[PDB]
PDB file of all heavy atoms in Angstrom:
ATOM      1  N   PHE A   1      79.296  79.349  84.778  1.00  0.00           N
ATOM      2  CA  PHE A   1      80.382  79.648  83.833  1.00  0.00           C
ATOM      3  C   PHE A   1      80.869  78.423  83.050  1.00  0.00           C
ATOM      4  O   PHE A   1      82.088  78.165  82.970  1.00  0.00           O
ATOM      5  CB  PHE A   1      81.518  80.371  84.575  1.00  0.00           C
ATOM      6  CG  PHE A   1      81.845  79.762  85.922  1.00  0.00           C
ATOM      7  CD1 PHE A   1      82.826  78.811  86.044  1.00  0.00           C
ATOM      8  CD2 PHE A   1      81.167  80.177  87.064  1.00  0.00           C
ATOM      9  CE1 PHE A   1      83.116  78.242  87.304  1.00  0.00           C
ATOM     10  CE2 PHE A   1      81.471  79.620  88.327  1.00  0.00           C
ATOM     11  CZ  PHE A   1      82.436  78.662  88.429  1.00  0.00           C
ATOM     12  N   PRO A   2      79.926  77.691  82.422  1.00  0.00           N
ATOM     13  CA  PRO A   2      80.294  76.588  81.513  1.00  0.00           C
ATOM     14  C   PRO A   2      81.043  77.184  80.333  1.00  0.00           C
ATOM     15  O   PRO A   2      80.813  78.376  79.971  1.00  0.00           O
ATOM     16  CB  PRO A   2      78.932  76.022  81.050  1.00  0.00           C
ATOM     17  CG  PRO A   2      77.985  77.231  81.195  1.00  0.00           C
ATOM     18  CD  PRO A   2      78.470  77.993  82.391  1.00  0.00           C
ATOM     19  N   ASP A   3      81.910  76.377  79.719  1.00  0.00           N
ATOM     20  CA  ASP A   3      82.653  76.828  78.574  1.00  0.00           C
ATOM     21  C   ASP A   3      82.028  76.344  77.273  1.00  0.00           C
ATOM     22  O   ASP A   3      81.420  75.293  77.207  1.00  0.00           O
ATOM     23  CB  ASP A   3      84.130  76.525  78.680  1.00  0.00           C
ATOM     24  CG  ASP A   3      84.432  75.039  78.738  1.00  0.00           C
ATOM     25  OD1 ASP A   3      83.615  74.267  79.266  1.00  0.00           O
ATOM     26  OD2 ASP A   3      85.498  74.702  78.241  1.00  0.00           O
ATOM     27  N   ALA A   4      82.215  77.123  76.240  1.00  0.00           N
ATOM     28  CA  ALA A   4      81.814  76.745  74.890  1.00  0.00           C
ATOM     29  C   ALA A   4      82.613  77.549  73.854  1.00  0.00           C
ATOM     30  O   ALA A   4      82.469  78.779  73.776  1.00  0.00           O
ATOM     31  CB  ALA A   4      80.299  77.003  74.694  1.00  0.00           C
ATOM     32  N   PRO A   5      83.445  76.858  73.042  1.00  0.00           N
ATOM     33  CA  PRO A   5      84.144  77.587  71.978  1.00  0.00           C
ATOM     34  C   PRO A   5      83.118  78.229  71.064  1.00  0.00           C
ATOM     35  O   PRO A   5      82.039  77.667  70.799  1.00  0.00           O
ATOM     36  CB  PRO A   5      84.917  76.503  71.230  1.00  0.00           C
ATOM     37  CG  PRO A   5      85.097  75.373  72.280  1.00  0.00           C
ATOM     38  CD  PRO A   5      83.816  75.433  73.085  1.00  0.00           C
ATOM     39  N   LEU A   6      83.451  79.397  70.548  1.00  0.00           N
ATOM     40  CA  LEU A   6      82.518  80.086  69.667  1.00  0.00           C
ATOM     41  C   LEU A   6      82.141  79.273  68.484  1.00  0.00           C
ATOM     42  O   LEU A   6      80.980  79.304  68.035  1.00  0.00           O
ATOM     43  CB  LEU A   6      83.126  81.412  69.208  1.00  0.00           C
ATOM     44  CG  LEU A   6      82.212  82.386  68.501  1.00  0.00           C
ATOM     45  CD1 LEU A   6      80.863  82.611  69.255  1.00  0.00           C
ATOM     46  CD2 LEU A   6      82.985  83.701  68.303  1.00  0.00           C
ATOM     47  N   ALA A   7      83.090  78.506  67.966  1.00  0.00           N
ATOM     48  CA  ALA A   7      82.880  77.749  66.755  1.00  0.00           C
ATOM     49  C   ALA A   7      81.875  76.618  66.903  1.00  0.00           C
ATOM     50  O   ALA A   7      81.367  76.115  65.889  1.00  0.00           O
ATOM     51  CB  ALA A   7      84.202  77.177  66.231  1.00  0.00           C
ATOM     52  N   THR A   8      81.642  76.180  68.135  1.00  0.00           N
ATOM     53  CA  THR A   8      80.750  75.049  68.395  1.00  0.00           C
ATOM     54  C   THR A   8      79.553  75.376  69.288  1.00  0.00           C
ATOM     55  O   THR A   8      78.622  74.581  69.366  1.00  0.00           O
ATOM     56  CB  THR A   8      81.509  73.912  69.028  1.00  0.00           C
ATOM     57  OG1 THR A   8      82.037  74.374  70.264  1.00  0.00           O
ATOM     58  CG2 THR A   8      82.629  73.426  68.096  1.00  0.00           C
ATOM     59  N   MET A   9      79.571  76.535  69.931  1.00  0.00           N
ATOM     60  CA  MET A   9      78.559  76.927  70.885  1.00  0.00           C
ATOM     61  C   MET A   9      77.166  76.769  70.273  1.00  0.00           C
ATOM     62  O   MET A   9      76.901  77.297  69.199  1.00  0.00           O
ATOM     63  CB  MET A   9      78.749  78.384  71.253  1.00  0.00           C
ATOM     64  CG  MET A   9      77.899  78.849  72.358  1.00  0.00           C
ATOM     65  SD  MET A   9      77.961  80.628  72.614  1.00  0.00           S
ATOM     66  CE  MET A   9      79.687  80.811  73.193  1.00  0.00           C
ATOM     67  N   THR A  10      76.284  76.058  70.965  1.00  0.00           N
ATOM     68  CA  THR A  10      74.931  75.797  70.461  1.00  0.00           C
ATOM     69  C   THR A  10      73.925  76.861  70.975  1.00  0.00           C
ATOM     70  O   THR A  10      74.155  77.536  71.966  1.00  0.00           O
ATOM     71  CB  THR A  10      74.427  74.412  70.947  1.00  0.00           C
ATOM     72  OG1 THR A  10      74.286  74.430  72.370  1.00  0.00           O
ATOM     73  CG2 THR A  10      75.377  73.264  70.514  1.00  0.00           C
ATOM     74  N   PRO A  11      72.766  76.951  70.334  1.00  0.00           N
ATOM     75  CA  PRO A  11      71.738  77.844  70.830  1.00  0.00           C
ATOM     76  C   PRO A  11      71.368  77.505  72.274  1.00  0.00           C
ATOM     77  O   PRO A  11      71.077  78.428  73.081  1.00  0.00           O
ATOM     78  CB  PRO A  11      70.601  77.622  69.841  1.00  0.00           C
ATOM     79  CG  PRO A  11      71.292  77.294  68.540  1.00  0.00           C
ATOM     80  CD  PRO A  11      72.493  76.470  68.967  1.00  0.00           C
ATOM     81  N   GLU A  12      71.361  76.217  72.594  1.00  0.00           N
ATOM     82  CA  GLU A  12      71.048  75.765  73.963  1.00  0.00           C
ATOM     83  C   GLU A  12      72.076  76.281  74.966  1.00  0.00           C
ATOM     84  O   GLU A  12      71.716  76.735  76.064  1.00  0.00           O
ATOM     85  CB  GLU A  12      70.959  74.235  74.050  1.00  0.00           C
ATOM     86  CG  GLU A  12      70.598  73.699  75.433  1.00  0.00           C
ATOM     87  CD  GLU A  12      70.463  72.176  75.451  1.00  0.00           C
ATOM     88  OE1 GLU A  12      69.649  71.651  74.671  1.00  0.00           O
ATOM     89  OE2 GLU A  12      71.165  71.522  76.240  1.00  0.00           O
ATOM     90  N   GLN A  13      73.352  76.218  74.619  1.00  0.00           N
ATOM     91  CA  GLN A  13      74.408  76.741  75.504  1.00  0.00           C
ATOM     92  C   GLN A  13      74.267  78.269  75.686  1.00  0.00           C
ATOM     93  O   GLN A  13      74.401  78.822  76.815  1.00  0.00           O
ATOM     94  CB  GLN A  13      75.777  76.374  74.943  1.00  0.00           C
ATOM     95  CG  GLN A  13      76.124  74.903  75.112  1.00  0.00           C
ATOM     96  CD  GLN A  13      77.480  74.525  74.484  1.00  0.00           C
ATOM     97  OE1 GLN A  13      77.728  74.788  73.323  1.00  0.00           O
ATOM     98  NE2 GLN A  13      78.355  73.900  75.294  1.00  0.00           N
ATOM     99  N   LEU A  14      74.020  78.970  74.583  1.00  0.00           N
ATOM    100  CA  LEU A  14      73.946  80.436  74.617  1.00  0.00           C
ATOM    101  C   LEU A  14      72.738  80.872  75.453  1.00  0.00           C
ATOM    102  O   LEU A  14      72.846  81.697  76.372  1.00  0.00           O
ATOM    103  CB  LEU A  14      73.818  81.011  73.197  1.00  0.00           C
ATOM    104  CG  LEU A  14      73.689  82.518  73.048  1.00  0.00           C
ATOM    105  CD1 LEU A  14      74.871  83.264  73.748  1.00  0.00           C
ATOM    106  CD2 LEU A  14      73.645  82.800  71.562  1.00  0.00           C
ATOM    107  N   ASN A  15      71.565  80.338  75.129  1.00  0.00           N
ATOM    108  CA  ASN A  15      70.370  80.703  75.857  1.00  0.00           C
ATOM    109  C   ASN A  15      70.421  80.295  77.329  1.00  0.00           C
ATOM    110  O   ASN A  15      69.951  81.037  78.193  1.00  0.00           O
ATOM    111  CB  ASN A  15      69.109  80.185  75.170  1.00  0.00           C
ATOM    112  CG  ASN A  15      68.799  80.962  73.898  1.00  0.00           C
ATOM    113  OD1 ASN A  15      68.353  82.108  73.952  1.00  0.00           O
ATOM    114  ND2 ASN A  15      69.052  80.348  72.749  1.00  0.00           N
ATOM    115  N   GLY A  16      70.997  79.125  77.623  1.00  0.00           N
ATOM    116  CA  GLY A  16      71.089  78.656  78.975  1.00  0.00           C
ATOM    117  C   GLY A  16      71.889  79.545  79.904  1.00  0.00           C
ATOM    118  O   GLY A  16      71.450  79.852  81.026  1.00  0.00           O
ATOM    119  N   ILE A  17      73.061  80.010  79.464  1.00  0.00           N
ATOM    120  CA  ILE A  17      73.851  80.845  80.314  1.00  0.00           C
ATOM    121  C   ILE A  17      73.240  82.242  80.515  1.00  0.00           C
ATOM    122  O   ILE A  17      73.364  82.846  81.603  1.00  0.00           O
ATOM    123  CB  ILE A  17      75.311  80.931  79.767  1.00  0.00           C
ATOM    124  CG1 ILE A  17      76.249  81.417  80.850  1.00  0.00           C
ATOM    125  CG2 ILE A  17      75.397  81.774  78.488  1.00  0.00           C
ATOM    126  CD1 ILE A  17      77.731  81.279  80.505  1.00  0.00           C
ATOM    127  N   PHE A  18      72.587  82.762  79.489  1.00  0.00           N
ATOM    128  CA  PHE A  18      71.841  84.007  79.607  1.00  0.00           C
ATOM    129  C   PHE A  18      70.646  83.908  80.546  1.00  0.00           C
ATOM    130  O   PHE A  18      70.404  84.846  81.303  1.00  0.00           O
ATOM    131  CB  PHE A  18      71.431  84.609  78.226  1.00  0.00           C
ATOM    132  CG  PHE A  18      72.500  85.491  77.640  1.00  0.00           C
ATOM    133  CD1 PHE A  18      73.552  84.919  76.934  1.00  0.00           C
ATOM    134  CD2 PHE A  18      72.525  86.861  77.890  1.00  0.00           C
ATOM    135  CE1 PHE A  18      74.582  85.699  76.443  1.00  0.00           C
ATOM    136  CE2 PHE A  18      73.559  87.660  77.401  1.00  0.00           C
ATOM    137  CZ  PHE A  18      74.605  87.071  76.704  1.00  0.00           C
ATOM    138  N   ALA A  19      69.949  82.776  80.538  1.00  0.00           N
ATOM    139  CA  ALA A  19      68.793  82.563  81.407  1.00  0.00           C
ATOM    140  C   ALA A  19      69.142  82.690  82.874  1.00  0.00           C
ATOM    141  O   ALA A  19      68.453  83.383  83.608  1.00  0.00           O
ATOM    142  CB  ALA A  19      68.100  81.166  81.092  1.00  0.00           C
ATOM    143  N   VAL A  20      70.269  82.112  83.282  1.00  0.00           N
ATOM    144  CA  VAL A  20      70.705  82.207  84.646  1.00  0.00           C
ATOM    145  C   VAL A  20      71.335  83.570  84.936  1.00  0.00           C
ATOM    146  O   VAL A  20      70.955  84.276  85.906  1.00  0.00           O
ATOM    147  CB  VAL A  20      71.717  81.067  85.006  1.00  0.00           C
ATOM    148  CG1 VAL A  20      72.246  81.247  86.439  1.00  0.00           C
ATOM    149  CG2 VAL A  20      71.030  79.680  84.916  1.00  0.00           C
ATOM    150  N   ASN A  21      72.343  83.905  84.144  1.00  0.00           N
ATOM    151  CA  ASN A  21      73.249  84.989  84.475  1.00  0.00           C
ATOM    152  C   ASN A  21      72.679  86.373  84.271  1.00  0.00           C
ATOM    153  O   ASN A  21      73.006  87.296  85.016  1.00  0.00           O
ATOM    154  CB  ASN A  21      74.543  84.942  83.681  1.00  0.00           C
ATOM    155  CG  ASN A  21      75.449  83.775  84.058  1.00  0.00           C
ATOM    156  OD1 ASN A  21      75.064  82.883  84.849  1.00  0.00           O
ATOM    157  ND2 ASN A  21      76.658  83.778  83.488  1.00  0.00           N
ATOM    158  N   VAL A  22      71.857  86.512  83.243  1.00  0.00           N
ATOM    159  CA  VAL A  22      71.218  87.800  82.927  1.00  0.00           C
ATOM    160  C   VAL A  22      69.765  87.841  83.408  1.00  0.00           C
ATOM    161  O   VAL A  22      69.442  88.707  84.197  1.00  0.00           O
ATOM    162  CB  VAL A  22      71.347  88.156  81.434  1.00  0.00           C
ATOM    163  CG1 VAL A  22      70.605  89.515  81.087  1.00  0.00           C
ATOM    164  CG2 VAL A  22      72.849  88.293  81.059  1.00  0.00           C
ATOM    165  N   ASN A  23      68.894  86.966  82.922  1.00  0.00           N
ATOM    166  CA  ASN A  23      67.512  86.975  83.370  1.00  0.00           C
ATOM    167  C   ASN A  23      67.420  86.827  84.883  1.00  0.00           C
ATOM    168  O   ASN A  23      66.633  87.517  85.517  1.00  0.00           O
ATOM    169  CB  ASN A  23      66.668  85.858  82.720  1.00  0.00           C
ATOM    170  CG  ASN A  23      66.582  85.993  81.220  1.00  0.00           C
ATOM    171  OD1 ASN A  23      67.108  86.946  80.619  1.00  0.00           O
ATOM    172  ND2 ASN A  23      65.934  85.024  80.592  1.00  0.00           N
ATOM    173  N   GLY A  24      68.255  85.979  85.481  1.00  0.00           N
ATOM    174  CA  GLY A  24      68.274  85.848  86.945  1.00  0.00           C
ATOM    175  C   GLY A  24      68.650  87.129  87.669  1.00  0.00           C
ATOM    176  O   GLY A  24      68.187  87.369  88.789  1.00  0.00           O
ATOM    177  N   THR A  25      69.511  87.942  87.053  1.00  0.00           N
ATOM    178  CA  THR A  25      69.863  89.259  87.615  1.00  0.00           C
ATOM    179  C   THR A  25      68.670  90.217  87.534  1.00  0.00           C
ATOM    180  O   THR A  25      68.242  90.849  88.538  1.00  0.00           O
ATOM    181  CB  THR A  25      71.117  89.838  86.931  1.00  0.00           C
ATOM    182  OG1 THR A  25      72.248  89.044  87.346  1.00  0.00           O
ATOM    183  CG2 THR A  25      71.318  91.323  87.315  1.00  0.00           C
ATOM    184  N   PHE A  26      68.088  90.319  86.338  1.00  0.00           N
ATOM    185  CA  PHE A  26      66.897  91.178  86.171  1.00  0.00           C
ATOM    186  C   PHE A  26      65.798  90.756  87.133  1.00  0.00           C
ATOM    187  O   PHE A  26      65.271  91.557  87.880  1.00  0.00           O
ATOM    188  CB  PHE A  26      66.338  91.118  84.747  1.00  0.00           C
ATOM    189  CG  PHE A  26      67.013  92.057  83.757  1.00  0.00           C
ATOM    190  CD1 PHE A  26      68.207  91.706  83.165  1.00  0.00           C
ATOM    191  CD2 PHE A  26      66.437  93.263  83.430  1.00  0.00           C
ATOM    192  CE1 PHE A  26      68.840  92.549  82.260  1.00  0.00           C
ATOM    193  CE2 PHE A  26      67.015  94.136  82.539  1.00  0.00           C
ATOM    194  CZ  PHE A  26      68.244  93.794  81.949  1.00  0.00           C
ATOM    195  N   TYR A  27      65.477  89.472  87.146  1.00  0.00           N
ATOM    196  CA  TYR A  27      64.330  88.973  87.924  1.00  0.00           C
ATOM    197  C   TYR A  27      64.517  89.141  89.430  1.00  0.00           C
ATOM    198  O   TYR A  27      63.572  89.470  90.149  1.00  0.00           O
ATOM    199  CB  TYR A  27      64.036  87.525  87.565  1.00  0.00           C
ATOM    200  CG  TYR A  27      63.630  87.264  86.124  1.00  0.00           C
ATOM    201  CD1 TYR A  27      63.683  85.981  85.582  1.00  0.00           C
ATOM    202  CD2 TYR A  27      63.137  88.284  85.305  1.00  0.00           C
ATOM    203  CE1 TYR A  27      63.295  85.733  84.294  1.00  0.00           C
ATOM    204  CE2 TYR A  27      62.760  88.027  84.002  1.00  0.00           C
ATOM    205  CZ  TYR A  27      62.870  86.759  83.502  1.00  0.00           C
ATOM    206  OH  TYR A  27      62.496  86.510  82.194  1.00  0.00           O
ATOM    207  N   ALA A  28      65.734  88.939  89.908  1.00  0.00           N
ATOM    208  CA  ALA A  28      66.034  89.105  91.330  1.00  0.00           C
ATOM    209  C   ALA A  28      65.788  90.533  91.752  1.00  0.00           C
ATOM    210  O   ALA A  28      65.159  90.787  92.807  1.00  0.00           O
ATOM    211  CB  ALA A  28      67.507  88.698  91.642  1.00  0.00           C
ATOM    212  N   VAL A  29      66.244  91.478  90.937  1.00  0.00           N
ATOM    213  CA  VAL A  29      66.039  92.896  91.219  1.00  0.00           C
ATOM    214  C   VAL A  29      64.547  93.292  91.145  1.00  0.00           C
ATOM    215  O   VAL A  29      64.007  93.927  92.044  1.00  0.00           O
ATOM    216  CB  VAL A  29      66.908  93.778  90.329  1.00  0.00           C
ATOM    217  CG1 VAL A  29      66.556  95.284  90.526  1.00  0.00           C
ATOM    218  CG2 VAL A  29      68.418  93.544  90.663  1.00  0.00           C
ATOM    219  N   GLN A  30      63.877  92.886  90.078  1.00  0.00           N
ATOM    220  CA  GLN A  30      62.446  93.187  89.948  1.00  0.00           C
ATOM    221  C   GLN A  30      61.627  92.593  91.073  1.00  0.00           C
ATOM    222  O   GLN A  30      60.708  93.271  91.597  1.00  0.00           O
ATOM    223  CB  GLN A  30      61.927  92.695  88.619  1.00  0.00           C
ATOM    224  CG  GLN A  30      62.490  93.408  87.418  1.00  0.00           C
ATOM    225  CD  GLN A  30      61.956  92.805  86.136  1.00  0.00           C
ATOM    226  OE1 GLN A  30      62.221  91.625  85.808  1.00  0.00           O
ATOM    227  NE2 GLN A  30      61.141  93.584  85.420  1.00  0.00           N
ATOM    228  N   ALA A  31      61.900  91.336  91.419  1.00  0.00           N
ATOM    229  CA  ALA A  31      61.207  90.687  92.535  1.00  0.00           C
ATOM    230  C   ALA A  31      61.328  91.445  93.846  1.00  0.00           C
ATOM    231  O   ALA A  31      60.368  91.483  94.608  1.00  0.00           O
ATOM    232  CB  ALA A  31      61.674  89.266  92.724  1.00  0.00           C
TER     233      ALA A  31
END
């Protein structure tokens, strides 16, 4: 749960939190 204001949030910040929080959820279940 890193923070990033919308006005400054980078592609790296956006993709990074999705990789853990969402892809990690999908992958754990599929595995």
